[PDB]
Amino acid sequence: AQVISETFSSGRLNRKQKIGIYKPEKYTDRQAYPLIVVLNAETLMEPVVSMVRYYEQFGEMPKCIVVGVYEPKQEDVTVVEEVGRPINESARFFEFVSAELVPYIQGKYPIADLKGVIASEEAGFLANYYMLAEKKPTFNMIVSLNPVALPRMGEEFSHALAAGVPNRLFYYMATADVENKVVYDKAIQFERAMRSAPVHESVEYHFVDFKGSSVNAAKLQGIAQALDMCFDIYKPIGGKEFKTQMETLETGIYEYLENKYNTIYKQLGVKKVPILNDVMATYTAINSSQDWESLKKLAKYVESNGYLKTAMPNFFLAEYYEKIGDDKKALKTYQKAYTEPNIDFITGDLINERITHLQAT
Amino acid sequence: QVISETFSSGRLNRKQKIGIYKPEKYTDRQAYPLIVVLNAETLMEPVVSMVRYYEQFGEMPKCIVVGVYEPKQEDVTVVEEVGRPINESARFFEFVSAELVPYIQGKYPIADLKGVIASEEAGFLANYYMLAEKKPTFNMIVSLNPVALPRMGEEFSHALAAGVPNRLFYYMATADVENKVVYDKAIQFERAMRSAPVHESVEYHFVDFKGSSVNAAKLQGIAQALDMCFDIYKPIGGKEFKTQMETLETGIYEYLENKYNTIYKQLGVKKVPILNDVMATYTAINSSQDWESLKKLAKYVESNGYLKTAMPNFFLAEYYEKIGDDKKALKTYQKAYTEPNIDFITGDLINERITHLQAT
């Protein structure tokens, strides 16, 4: 877990800005990574980096690149009550992230279509204004932790949420009331005004109120929750999910697996190689409902991604030919699978038993 | 910086991979609380990052964190047939207690507060340090998503009722999403554990995360555990000031003193009183006009950390003005003029006090 510190020369800020960059363990440009920007990084950086590594080890998250901004000035992250939008110093910092920092990272690294931003306090409220971008969203993920807000600006963000985005917007806001009372009340007033209008379907909205909780402890839990829900589609298929969403399907079982990994690419901007757990879950569900059309499509699907060098694709296909009554193609296909390495319960011995049974008849 | 090293264990009869976190700005001049992480292949970095986080906000003292990486299945697993650590599980249990912890105590000035963070099987194994009859090795136990034996619930319930010599902070968390078999056993175990009333020396917390994924819950568990266990270390807030302090007619100094005594008792560290806490105490003292607290506050700050500043004599000199003695007030103000300025207390202000006394 190495965060490399460097200075970024900013035209808008007219100063050298300290930033730092986390790159995953094995790093190749052959794949793409989602970007997470941290404005508060003197505090928030290490908890964010440690938690994205944590989730990645459990396979709940893809490898990500995290870029922190260290110790921005108060005037940089503060939206004044008078105007109600970033101006002067705050406007310069606001655009510095959008027009300078992020494109710089996109040039230096293969950044995926998913780019998030995490901020707290004044910067946490400043981060909201990326929703109002006229051109095209810079951030598809906005995490606002204990923001210092302006209640009067709630209605304007309400319209933005109702309008929606071209693809997806994940918004997470958290606040805590303990020794926060002035700030806490303004946060609630702002949030109430923001949820006034119904939220567009392209937007996933989350507001968590931590009551009886200290601010700093709530912010940590906010990061954990936000990352969990935003990247949730990346999670492996669980037994409960399998028993519910899959085994209850009579047909279109392969489509469930495909839709999941398609949704992963749409939301997270990354192409995930199907994990053996997800493949076997699909295969088991296929057998229980006896839907063999999914089995044929599953065979070609795993052949396309990652399993080409394994006996599995032709084993699935050979079984499919048996189910539809073609022994001739099944025998030829089993013999083709035998020439490929074993994976899981697919073995040379098992394939041979199938071949022996077909040559007996 | 987390430094990994191999540790030769007599009880494990092998070389165990461990790692150690020393705080930034380390010194031998102070003691640090020890936190042991059994699951550290996962839990190490989040724990270290969060104690850093809390320390930066002044909600935690500097701490030393040690952890063991990837213990064997049989090491952390308590079997159903017994309900206690045996063989490989017993050796590992005594490994961290009788070897690892003393080893760290030899390298560094470890404070009296020691704690253990663990999850899954190890999380349940950590509950048995509560049963040690010699003397508690860990005063802090955090069990995150434990794999539990509900049969042992009553036995732990007796130990919770019995109590501990000084203090025991216990935290257990669990989550039901795709946990269904494990979650149910955890709930059953907790209900049996919570049956008997808890002793005063034990602070018990069980947080049930419903509709939450397991791994996400464990992260929040750590955040909450650290927050509540070290809570006494936190600065005095405005709400706490207007409530617990400004509403006191007398014994205002005792409130400040009791807080830092509790910090030393629970956390095993001596915290230099921060200026905000002192000023809050001083402010409440003036509002309630309790001068007896002012004199004791002057001696207290002189004894901890403020000796080199004009503040102790300034407080004492003011106490003399309030009590009616202008002779000692003048003499004390003159002593205060020599020591360096702190905050609003300055040579100029003191000089104003002196000339007023010399005029009369």
Inter-residue contact A56 to A36 (CB < 8 Å): no
> Which residues from A are below 8 Å from B220, CB to CB?
220-221, 224-225
Chain B CB contacts of A58 below 8 Å: 42, 215
Inter-chain CB proximity A43 and B56 less than 8 Å: yes
Q: What is the DSSP letter of B113?
A: E
Which residues have CB under 8 Å from A350's CB, separation 6+?
A: none
Contacts for B347 with CB less than 8 Å, ≥ 6 apart: B310, B337, B341
CA-based nearest residue to A253, from A216, A285, A278, A300:
A285
DSSP one-letter code for B36: E
Q: Is B279 exposed, middle or buried (0-12, 13-18, 19+ CB in 10 A)?
A: middle
Closest CA to B162 of B130, B120, B207, B114: B130
Set of chain B residues whose Cβ sits within 8 Å of the Cβ of A241: 178
Cross-chain Cβ contact B223/A221 below 8 Å = yes
Whether the Cβ atoms of residue B163 and residue B202 lie closer than 8 Å to each other? yes
Query: Cβ neighbours of residue A360 under 8 Å, at least 6 residues apart?
Result: none
Read off the amino acid at residue A310: T
**Closest by CA position to B284, among listed B240, B350, B343, B349:** B240
- Token code pair at residue A241: 């999910």
Q: Are B165 and B133 in contact (CB under 8 A)?
A: no
Closest CA to A32 of A102, A109, A136: A109
Q: Do A51 and B219 touch (CB under 8 A)?
A: yes
Q: Which two tokens stand for residue B334?
A: 């003159």
CA angle A50, A69, A80 (to 5 degrees): 125
Buried b (16+ CB within 10 A) or exposed e, A18-29: bbbbbbbeeeee
Please, are residues A36 and A231 in contact by the beta-carbon 8 Å criterion? no
Element (H, E) at B236: none
Strand partners of residue A144 = A119, A173
Q: Report the SS3 class of residue B294.
A: helix
Instruction: Give the residue from A40, A50, A229, A231 with the most B CB atoms within 10 Å of its CB, the best one to mutate.
Output: A50
Burial class (CB in 10 A: 0-12, 13-18, 19+), B3: exposed
- Interface residue ranges in chain A relative to chain B, Cβ cutoff 8 Å: 1, 43, 46-47, 49-51, 53-55, 57-58, 60, 178-179, 181, 213-214, 216-217, 220-221, 224-225, 227-228, 232, 235, 238-241
Tokens of A72: 């921005």
Pairing relation of β-strands A33-38 and A15-22?
unpaired
List CB contacts of A118: < 8 A, sequence separation 6 or more: A36, A37, A38, A39, A40, A44, A48, A127, A143, A145, A223, A226
Quote the CA–CA distance of B230 and B228 in Å, as a whole number.
Answer: 6
Q: What are phi and psi of B152, to 5 degrees?
A: -85, 0
Give me the sheet containing B14-21, strands edge to edge.
B2-9, B14-21, B64-68, B32-37, B110-119, B140-146, B168-177, B202-213
A104 in Cβ contact with A69 (< 8 Å): no
Cβ contact (<8 Å) for B49 and A54? Answer: no
In contact, B252 and B293? CB cutoff 8 Å: yes
Please list the helix, strand and coil fractions of chain B in percent, rounded to the nearest 5, in that order.
50, 20, 30
Chain B residues close to A228, C-beta within 8 Å: 213, 215-216
Asked whether B99 and B128 are in contact (CB, 8 A), the reply is no
- Number of A/B CB contacts below 8 angstroms equals 80
| Cβ(B59)–Cβ(B263) below 8 Å | no
The two structure tokens encoding residue B66? 């040690």
Q: What six digits make up the tokens of B220? A: 């929040």
Way it was determined: X-ray
DSSP string of B40-90, one letter each residue: HHHHHHHHHHHHHHHHHTTSS---EEEEE----HHHHPPPTTTSS--THHH
Cβ proximity of B226 and B54 under 8 Å: yes
Instruction: Give the residue among A101, A156, A99, A102 at the shortest CA–CA distance from A125.
Output: A156
- Cα torsion B137, B140, B142, B147: sign: positive
Amino acid at site B335: K
Through-space distance between the first and last CA atoms of chain A, rounded to whole angstroms: 60
Which residue of chain A is at minimal alpha-carbon distance from B58? A216
Neighbours of B5 (CB within 10 A): 9
Helix pair A293-304, A276-288: axis angle to 10 deg: 170
Instruction: Assign B37 to helix, strand or coil.
Output: strand
How far is residue B130's CA from residue B138's CA, in Å, rounded to a whole number?
8
Cα distance between residue A150 and residue A86, in whole Å: 12
Residues of B in contact with A216 (CB under 8 A): 53-54, 57, 59, 227
**C-alpha closest to that of A343 among A249, A275, A265, A252:** A275
Beta bridge partners of A10: A15
B49:A47 CB<8 A: yes
Q: Which two tokens stand for residue B289?
A: 């006009």
What is the distance in angstroms between the CA of the first residue and the CA of the last residue of chain B? 62
Q: How close does chain A come to B243, measured CA to CA in Å?
A: 12
Contacts of B234 in chain A (CB under 8 A): 214
A49 interaction partners in chain B (CB closer than 8 Å): 49
**Tokens encoding A89:** 């110093």
CA distance B220 to chain A (A): 5
Q: For residue A361, with 0-12 CB atoms within 10 Å meaning exposed, 13-18 middle and 19 or more buried, which class applies? A: exposed
* SS3 assignment for chain A: CCEEEEEEEECCCCEEEEEEEECCCCCCCCCCEEEEEECCHHHHHHHHHHHHHHHHHCCCCCCCEEEEECCCCHHHHCCCCCCCCCCCHHHHHHHHHHHHHHHHHHHHCCEEEEEEEEEEHHHHHHHHHHHHCCCCCCCCEEEEEEECCCHHHHHHHHHHHHHCCCCCEEEEEEEEEECCHHHHHHHHHHHHHHCCCCCCCCEEEEEEEEEEEEHHHHHHHHHHHHHHHHCHHHCCCCHHHHHHHHCCCCCCHHHHHHHHHHHHHHHHCCCCCCCHHHHHHHHHHHHHCCCCHHHHHHHHHHHHCCCCCCCHHHHHHHHHHHHCCCHHHHHHHHHHHCCCCCECCECHHHHHHHHHHHHHC
Query: If you ran DSSP here, which 8-state letter would residue B270 be given?
Result: -
Q: Which domains does chain B possess? A: 1-266 (3.40.50.1820), 267-360 (1.25.40.10)
Task: Say yes or no for a CB contact (<8 Å) between A216 and B54.
Answer: yes
> What is the rounded radius of gyration, in angstroms, for the C-alpha atoms of chain A?
25
Residue whose C-alpha is closest to residue A126's, from A166, A167, A69: A69
Q: Quick one: three-class SS letters along B163-213?
A: CCCCCEEEEEEEEEECCHHHHHHHHHHHHHHCCCCCCCCEEEEEEEEEEEE
Question: Which chain A positions have a beta carbon within 8 Å of B240's beta carbon?
Answer: 179
Q: Which two tokens stand for residue A35?
A: 């970007």
Closest chain B residue to A56 measured between Cα atoms? B42
Q: Which of A43, A179, A232 sits opposite B53 (nearest CB)?
A: A43
Residue with tokens 């299945």: B73
| Chain B residues with beta carbon closer than 8 angstroms to that of A227 | 216
Beta-carbon contacts of residue A82 (< 8 Å; ≥ 6 apart) = none
Distance from CA of B103 to the nearest CA of A (A): 26
Matching residue, tokens 């699909």: A282
- Distance from C-alpha of A103 to C-alpha of A210, rounded to nearest angstrom: 35
Selection from B151, B134, B242 nearest residue B189 by Cα:
B151
The C-alpha atoms of residue A356 and residue B4 are separated, in whole angstroms, by: 55
Residues A232/B178, Cβ–Cβ less than 8 Å: no
Closest approach of chain A CAs to the CA of B245, in angstroms? Answer: 15
Partner-chain residue, chosen from A58, A60, A179, that has the shortest CB–CB distance to B238 = A179
Which residue is listed with tokens 């309900």? B83
Cα dihedral: A284, A287, A290, A291 (round 10) = 50
Dihedral, CA of residue B36, residue B41, residue B46 and residue B52, to nearest 10: 50
| DSSP code at position B234 | S
Residue B275 CA: distances (Å) to CA of A134, A247, B304: 48, 64, 12
B/e letters for B40-64, b = 16+ CB within 10 Å, e = fewer, are: bbbbbbbbbbbbbbbbeeebbbbbb
- Cα dihedral A299, A300, A301, A304, rounded to 10, equals 130
Strand-strand pairing, A111-120 and A141-147 = parallel
Interface of B with A (CB under 8 A): 41-42, 45-46, 48-50, 52-54, 56-57, 59, 177-178, 180, 213, 215-216, 219-220, 223-224, 226-227, 231, 234, 237-240
How far apart CA B313 and CA B192 sit, in angstroms, is 57
C-beta of residue B235 within 8 angstroms of C-beta of residue B156: no
In chain B, whose CA is at the least distance from the CA of A235? B213
State how far the Cα of A32 lies from the Cα of A107, in Å rounded to an integer. Answer: 12
Q: Which residues of B9-35 are buried (b: 16+ CB within 10 A; e: fewer)?
A: bebbeeebbbbbbbbeeeeeeebbbbb
Coil, helix or strand for B242?
A: helix
Cβ atoms B145, B214 nearer than 8 A: yes
Q: What are the angstrom distances between the C-alpha of A159 and each of A170, A197, B147?
A: 16, 7, 47
